[PDB]
Amino acid sequence: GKERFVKLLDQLHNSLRIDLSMYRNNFPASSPERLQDLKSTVDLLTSITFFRMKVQELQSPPRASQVVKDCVKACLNSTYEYIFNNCHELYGREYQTDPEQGPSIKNLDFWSKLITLIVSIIEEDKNSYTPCLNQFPQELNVGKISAEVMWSLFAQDMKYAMEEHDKHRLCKSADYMNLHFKVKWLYNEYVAELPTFKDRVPEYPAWFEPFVIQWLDENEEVSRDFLHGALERDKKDGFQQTSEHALFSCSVVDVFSQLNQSFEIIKKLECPDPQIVGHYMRRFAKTISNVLLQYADIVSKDFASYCSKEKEKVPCILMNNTQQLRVQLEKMFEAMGGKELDAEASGTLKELQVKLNNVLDELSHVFATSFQPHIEECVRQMGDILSQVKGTGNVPASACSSVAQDADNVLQPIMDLLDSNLTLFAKICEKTVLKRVLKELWKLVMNTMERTIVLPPEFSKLKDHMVREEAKSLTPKQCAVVELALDTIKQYFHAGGVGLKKTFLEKSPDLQSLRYALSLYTQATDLLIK
């Protein structure tokens, strides 16, 4: 009786389920009349379900929104199987231009085509079928289900496929790189904002992690080969400063223009896994180091070759270049996250900022020592003039030379250095660089003077062992001329305020070593009670 009726409904409910489990094939989006029949088919199913929820007062858990939902998922699983098995013909028929068959290990084309066909499905379920099945908007969004199912099926195939390529690597890294990019767009466009995924971090970046580390390895080798040819193009050019305001040559902007391009690649992927992005940054910090350290190692190898009077601007530029590495690195360090950057990556660059700074010191030391022969010749030449200083006002001569005049005559040999160069340096030197070069020339002058004009007394066998002889005192005038000459040298390094701060010159231990040396010869005018 009524048992013949319940079996009748089950068979009809079942028959409609079968029809909806292939809705895409049974109700093509091409036909508006057929999409209406789909709408009608879902209407008839809800009415049956609704009737059973009421009259069949027994519990009827088959809520209509879930039955349709599960029918849609079935069709999607079928759809994915169809496009997966006909990826080539479907793509070439529509998304074509000029001209095994599924997943290949020699090639990735199949996957870029599949992603295109997947989007076509999702877009179709969004534009065509979601407006059609508007019976339960709060619980049935075909387009959102399409994105979820199609991604999930695609994801588990892609996962396995990349595990296979990881153990083979028969394709260009550029191909794995472009695929990672196309997958990103797919995920962020259709999946990222879904409830199932709008929470935890995706897993797709891990599929490609080994392939970018390979691209980063290959990328570092391309950066080395670019560095070398970037300096030779600048060496043959003569290290011309790029502009009157730019104190560095063209090879510096070339190296950092590339290193940024390479970094930009890793950013277009918008890797959403912080553990993985930290891994990429860790590796690229190693590239930045080896590259920049190579830049620094190339100049040190050739820096002395440029230390001479002929080209004295060029050695100054190479120091400006080395300093420029220190600052544009910092600008790069910030681009990579600053303090947000991975610790190991941040430590690789700060440890590089140090080694780079130590190179600048070694370079300035080599540049100051490039003058040591000329300085020693200037200091023995001013020591001879000091020895010719003597009081002459004994007789009404009037033509006697004052202490002030004599100090100028003593400094004049070394003045050809200050005016001709220390006005050329500050003209073509980074502030930081100039400060380093002068601090080095300063040391060399105070050192040379402490060895030349002082003429420290020698050892000789006195009685039964070696004793140092008494110092030959300078005459009172000579004392006054030395001290004034020395104070003048200090002022010229101060250069009002352009050079070294008076606080450092006074505390300089090379000045204290010279002042103590003089004190042996300055007994005539030194005060007992200061």
Author numbering: 942 to 1040, 1050 to 1480
Paste lines from the article.
Munc13–1 acts as a master regulator of neurotransmitter release, playing a crucial role in release itself and multiple functions in integrating the effects of diverse signals that alter release probability during presynaptic plasticity. Thus, neurotransmitter release is completely abrogated in the absence of Munc13s. However, the C1-C2B region and the C-terminal C2C domain are also critical for release, which may arise because these domains help bridge the vesicle and plasma membranes.
The structure of C1C2BMUN can be viewed as a highly elongated rod spanning ca. 195 Å and is formed mostly of α-helical bundles, with a total of 26 helices; the C1 and C2B domains pack at the N-terminal end of the rod. Comparison of our C1C2BMUN structure with the crystal structure of the almost complete MUN domain (with the N-terminus at residue 933), which was described in Yang et al. (2015) and we re-refined, shows that the MUN domain is very similar in both structures, as expected because this structure was used in crystallographic phase determination by the molecular replacement method. Note in this context that the similarity in the structures of the two molecules from the asymmetric unit of the C1C2BMUN crystals and between these structures and that of the nearly complete MUN domain suggest that the overall architecture of C1C2BMUN has limited flexibility.
